[PDB]
Design an enzyme around this catalytic site. Structure first.
Site, short mmCIF file in Angstrom:
data_model
loop_
_atom_site.label_atom_id
_atom_site.label_comp_id
_atom_site.label_asym_id
_atom_site.label_seq_id
_atom_site.Cartn_x
_atom_site.Cartn_y
_atom_site.Cartn_z
N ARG A 1 49.08 37.04 39.18
CA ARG A 1 47.83 36.36 38.88
C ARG A 1 48.10 35.04 38.17
O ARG A 1 48.81 35.00 37.16
CB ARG A 1 46.89 37.22 38.03
CG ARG A 1 45.47 36.68 38.02
CD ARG A 1 44.59 37.33 36.97
NE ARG A 1 44.54 38.78 37.10
CZ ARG A 1 43.64 39.43 37.84
NH1 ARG A 1 42.73 38.75 38.53
NH2 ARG A 1 43.66 40.76 37.89
N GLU B 1 47.84 42.16 31.99
CA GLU B 1 47.76 40.94 31.19
C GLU B 1 46.34 40.63 30.74
O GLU B 1 46.14 40.14 29.62
CB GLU B 1 48.34 39.74 31.95
CG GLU B 1 48.36 38.50 31.07
CD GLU B 1 49.08 37.31 31.68
OE1 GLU B 1 49.79 37.49 32.69
OE2 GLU B 1 48.95 36.20 31.13
N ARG B 2 45.32 40.90 31.57
CA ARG B 2 43.95 40.69 31.12
C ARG B 2 43.63 41.62 29.95
O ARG B 2 43.09 41.18 28.93
CB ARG B 2 42.95 40.89 32.26
CG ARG B 2 43.10 39.91 33.42
CD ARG B 2 41.93 40.02 34.42
NE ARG B 2 40.68 39.59 33.82
CZ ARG B 2 39.61 40.36 33.57
NH1 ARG B 2 39.58 41.65 33.90
NH2 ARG B 2 38.56 39.81 33.01
#
Ligand SMILES: Nc1ccn([C@@H]2O[C@H](COP(=O)(O)OP(=O)(O)OP(=O)(O)S)[C@@H](O)[C@H]2O)c(=O)n1
Ligand SMILES: Nc1ccn([C@@H]2O[C@H](COP(=O)(O)OP(=O)(O)OP(=O)(O)S)[C@@H](O)[C@H]2O)c(=O)n1
Ligand SMILES: [Mg+2]
Ligand SMILES: [Mg+2]
Lengths: 195, 196
Positions: free
Chosen positions: B17, B56-57
């Site tokens: 991403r 990661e979010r």
């Protein structure tokens, strides 16, 4: 903690927020579990003599179809209302990779890690044609790929624009297309008119 | 149940991403304030700490929510294996359709006796998202099916909710789909129906 629970000790929530279970996507999930296992534990709560699913029914169904006998799980001691809040949060608080991010992921598996498209299909649980068509997007000009990434151009629009021989024309037609929310059919006609 | 110090985790510079929508990250953070992190992040040992495989979010949103630690699963994998896991975590998912989402909010309100504001806080969704979704449920059954299968966007559906009479609304909804009308065209055609 994350433990392995016998798959038969787990039953569905008949009041789960999801009511439509797409068969094809459940099969894609099961293929990914054959390759990778279940990556994210399902959430359950003690119920009857076993466990009721809070979040993770597709993983549980697809694990059954993949012949697994146990599933990673987290047991939550929660109210019915909070269990339903959690079921909604698990599905609603997510952001997908955009089509270019997905394609670039396959490309890295092919280029850096030296996998064939078929091998990628097996490892990620996707149809090979899905991998192949995603990779074809990367031939688009940078600005056009940006439009696919931010959703201003669908994958169908992008597929039609791939027919344009000249990169400048492609860029010009893509500008006309996305600007007017011009239809895929009208985009295909425009590509023909250009050549 | 393993909790790792949030400072001991760092991102994979080669993560799949590249784009992080800030509005959606804020919603994720609001949901973590209310529920914590439901889904442990996947990490691998790296340097003196851990490198994210998937999550990661969640990690960024946990920082914004003020958490000092995040639930995690440590995986001992190769680089190619870690990258495959990162892709699969994002690609092998199916979202609730907009009517399934709206019916969920409705159940929180009607059955569990939450206010719309409480629904907003507990699920981490903006006040207006909840209100707009609930309004969809007043649509006729055939029009609701069009929203559910993506034929009608929520923006189209919202404008159509202005039509006072149900027979007119169903007629107009077909025209929207038949004619691929924009939202703004749909608004025009609704406004005229109101004049009669
Ligand atoms: N091999 C895999 C492939 C995917 N996943 C995770 O599986 C969840 C699917 O998400 P969903 O499609 O919503 O299905 P789910 O199970 O939650 O049912 P449910 O209660 O909503 S009906 C997402 O987190 C994915 O990363 C996994 O752990 N292992
Ligand atoms: N309070 C919450 C709200 C959401 N989630 C889960 O959080 C994942 C988000 O999914 P994503 O948007 O893809 O973000 P993510 O973290 O994986 O980063 P990343 O490596 O792709 S860039 C999904 O499983 C959600 O059910 C959670 O556990 N607790
Ligand atoms: Mg889910
Ligand atoms: Mg993710």
């Amino acid at each position: 903690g994350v433990l392995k629970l016998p798959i038969e000790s787990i039953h569905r929530d008949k009041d789960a927020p999801r009511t439509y279970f797409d068969e094809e996507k459940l099969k894609e999930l099961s293929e990914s579990i054959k390759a990778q296992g279940v990556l994210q534990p399902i959430l359950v709560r003690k119920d009857g003599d076993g466990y009721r699913i809070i979040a993770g029914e597709r993983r549980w169904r697809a694990s059954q179809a993949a012949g697994l006998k146990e599933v990673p799980a987290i047991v939550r001691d929660v109210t019915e209302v909070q269990a339903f809040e959690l079921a909604l949060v698990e599905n609603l608080q997510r952001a997908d990779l955009n089509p270019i991010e997905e394609a670039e992921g396959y490309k890295r598996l092919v280029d850096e890690f030296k996998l064939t498209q078929e091998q990628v299909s097996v490892r990620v649980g996707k149809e090979r044609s899905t991998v192949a068509n995603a990779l074809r997007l990367l031939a688009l000009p940078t600005d056009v790929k940006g439009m696919v990434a931010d959703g201003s151009l669908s994958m169908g629009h992008a597929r039609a624009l791939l027919g344009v021989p000249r990169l400048p024309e492609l860029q010009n037609l893509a500008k006309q297309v996305a600007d007017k929310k011009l239809s895929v059919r009208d985009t295909e006609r425009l590509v023909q008119q250009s050549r």
